[PDB]
Write an enzyme that holds these catalytic residues in place. Sequence first.
Site, PDB file in Angstrom:
ATOM      1  N   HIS A  68       1.353   3.368  -9.603  1.00 55.80           N
ATOM      2  CA  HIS A  68       0.875   2.950  -8.285  1.00 55.80           C
ATOM      3  C   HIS A  68       2.012   3.099  -7.268  1.00 55.80           C
ATOM      4  CE1 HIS A  68      -2.935   0.722  -9.270  1.00 55.80           C
ATOM      5  NE2 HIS A  68      -2.444   0.889 -10.504  1.00 55.80           N
ATOM      6  N   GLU A 116       5.163   0.400  -9.527  1.00 58.84           N
ATOM      7  CA  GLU A 116       5.021   0.567  -8.085  1.00 58.84           C
ATOM      8  C   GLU A 116       6.209   1.386  -7.602  1.00 58.84           C
ATOM      9  OE1 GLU A 116       2.664  -0.077  -6.182  1.00 58.84           O
ATOM     10  OE2 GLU A 116       1.384  -1.428  -7.343  1.00 58.84           O
TER      11      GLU A 116
HETATM   12  C1  LIG Z   1       1.414  -1.922  -2.228  1.00 60.52           C
HETATM   13  C2  LIG Z   1       0.900  -2.059  -3.671  1.00 60.52           C
HETATM   14  C3  LIG Z   1       1.524  -3.288  -4.342  1.00 60.52           C
HETATM   15  C4  LIG Z   1      -0.646  -2.096  -3.669  1.00 60.52           C
HETATM   16  N1  LIG Z   1      -1.119  -3.358  -3.088  1.00 60.52           N
HETATM   17  C5  LIG Z   1      -2.058  -3.430  -2.143  1.00 60.52           C
HETATM   18  O1  LIG Z   1      -2.547  -2.430  -1.585  1.00 60.52           O
HETATM   19  O2  LIG Z   1      -2.371  -4.707  -1.748  1.00 60.52           O
HETATM   20  C6  LIG Z   1      -3.498  -4.886  -0.860  1.00 60.52           C
HETATM   21  C7  LIG Z   1      -4.197  -6.107  -0.940  1.00 60.52           C
HETATM   22  C8  LIG Z   1      -4.844  -6.644   0.204  1.00 60.52           C
HETATM   23  C9  LIG Z   1      -5.497  -7.906   0.126  1.00 60.52           C
HETATM   24  C10 LIG Z   1      -5.507  -8.631  -1.093  1.00 60.52           C
HETATM   25  C11 LIG Z   1      -4.865  -8.098  -2.240  1.00 60.52           C
HETATM   26  C12 LIG Z   1      -4.214  -6.839  -2.165  1.00 60.52           C
HETATM   27  P1  LIG Z   1      -1.415  -1.858  -5.319  1.00 60.52           P
HETATM   28  O3  LIG Z   1      -0.813  -0.673  -5.965  1.00 60.52           O
HETATM   29  O4  LIG Z   1      -2.873  -1.852  -5.078  1.00 60.52           O
HETATM   30  O5  LIG Z   1      -1.052  -3.157  -6.184  1.00 60.52           O
HETATM   31  C13 LIG Z   1      -1.740  -3.321  -7.431  1.00 60.52           C
HETATM   32  C14 LIG Z   1      -3.120  -3.952  -7.201  1.00 60.52           C
HETATM   33  O6  LIG Z   1      -3.207  -4.846  -6.330  1.00 60.52           O
HETATM   34  O7  LIG Z   1      -4.062  -3.493  -7.885  1.00 60.52           O
HETATM   35  C15 LIG Z   1      -0.913  -4.135  -8.458  1.00 60.52           C
HETATM   36  C16 LIG Z   1       0.477  -4.386  -8.270  1.00 60.52           C
HETATM   37  C17 LIG Z   1       1.206  -5.090  -9.264  1.00 60.52           C
HETATM   38  C18 LIG Z   1       0.553  -5.548 -10.441  1.00 60.52           C
HETATM   39  C19 LIG Z   1      -0.830  -5.298 -10.625  1.00 60.52           C
HETATM   40  N2  LIG Z   1      -1.464  -5.722 -11.748  1.00 60.52           N
HETATM   41  C20 LIG Z   1      -2.634  -6.417 -11.729  1.00 60.52           C
HETATM   42  N3  LIG Z   1      -3.367  -6.504 -12.839  1.00 60.52           N
HETATM   43  N4  LIG Z   1      -3.057  -7.045 -10.621  1.00 60.52           N
HETATM   44  C21 LIG Z   1      -1.545  -4.592  -9.630  1.00 60.52           C
HETATM   45 ZN   LIG Z   2      -2.341   0.673  -6.323  1.00 61.35          ZN
END
Ligand SMILES: CC(C)[C@H](NC(=O)OCc1ccccc1)P(=O)(O)O[C@H](C(=O)O)c1cccc(NC(=N)N)c1
Ligand SMILES: [Zn+2]
Length: 304
Positions: free
Chosen positions: A192, A266
Amino acid sequence: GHSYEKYNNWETIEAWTKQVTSENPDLISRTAIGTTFLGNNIYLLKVGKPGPNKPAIFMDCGFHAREWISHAFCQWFVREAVLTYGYESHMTEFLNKLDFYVLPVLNIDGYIYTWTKNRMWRKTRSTNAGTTCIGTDPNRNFDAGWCTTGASTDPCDETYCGSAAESEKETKALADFIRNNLSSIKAYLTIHSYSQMILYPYSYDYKLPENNAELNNLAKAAVKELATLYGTKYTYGPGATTIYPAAGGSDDWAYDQGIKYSFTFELRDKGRYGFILPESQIQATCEETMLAIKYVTNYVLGHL
Ligand SMILES: CC(C)[C@H](NC(=O)OCc1ccccc1)P(=O)(O)O[C@H](C(=O)O)c1cccc(NC(=N)N)c1
Ligand SMILES: [Zn+2]
């Protein structure tokens, strides 16, 4: 045409999966593990020297459409594997001993949408009953404390958890494949951006995984390895406390299937460019990320 230092659209990535497979018949095999909502083929590349009863590491990119550096990394990884096999001792050992399942782009429909309509799109592009709002967040759609925290029940929101766990063809396909290959898959790596972090379970609850001390040490070692190349600083830890709590993620689900090494990566950066990471940074980003992925791979190989 396809370049490894540019972001490639889906038509190009698809052509590339066929081409790189044709060019490397004893290192790469291609299959499709399902179709998307809009009918695109979810390709999986099996990278490694074929053999009986080989263990595997599963890595996917492109869960989220706008995270273009993720898609770029899976492509970079495949070239590095085929370029260096037989020349660099570690990668040679890796491909001799295990198979890498590389899924270049999971959320193909969303990725196409970021190329055609909305660069900041995140979710899938499936329709939702009773509304014109489109899409489900694939990383809120797995059966891991599904939709209990850090997720929305509203299809109009960016973190919509979907109508039910694995409601999306894409996440069902991925879950099906992993469930079908649990005896071989030893680690799960999901790529990600952005934030420069390595996360491990859990995100859906604040409870810690049984092997959290080991995962912490492994993540620590992986980030210090990454930093050797360009000084890029990654933080690391269990998802809930390290970034935010959020249910239905594939890293948590894969872990609870019994895959003990499960990480969300990330990549760059930390917000200056965010999702719109310059193409000029692809090479350096992929280069340093390789070091972390290879450290993890070697560690997992030493713990079969
Ligand atoms: C910038 C990056 C951290 C991304 N985050 C993101 O777009 O956040 C937006 C958002 C907006 C409102 C509420 C929650 C999230 P993303 O890659 O989407 O982050 C993952 C996710 O939220 O699915 C992520 C980051 C770290 C751990 C995990 N693991 C998990 N099972 N949640 C998942
Ligand atoms: Zn993501």
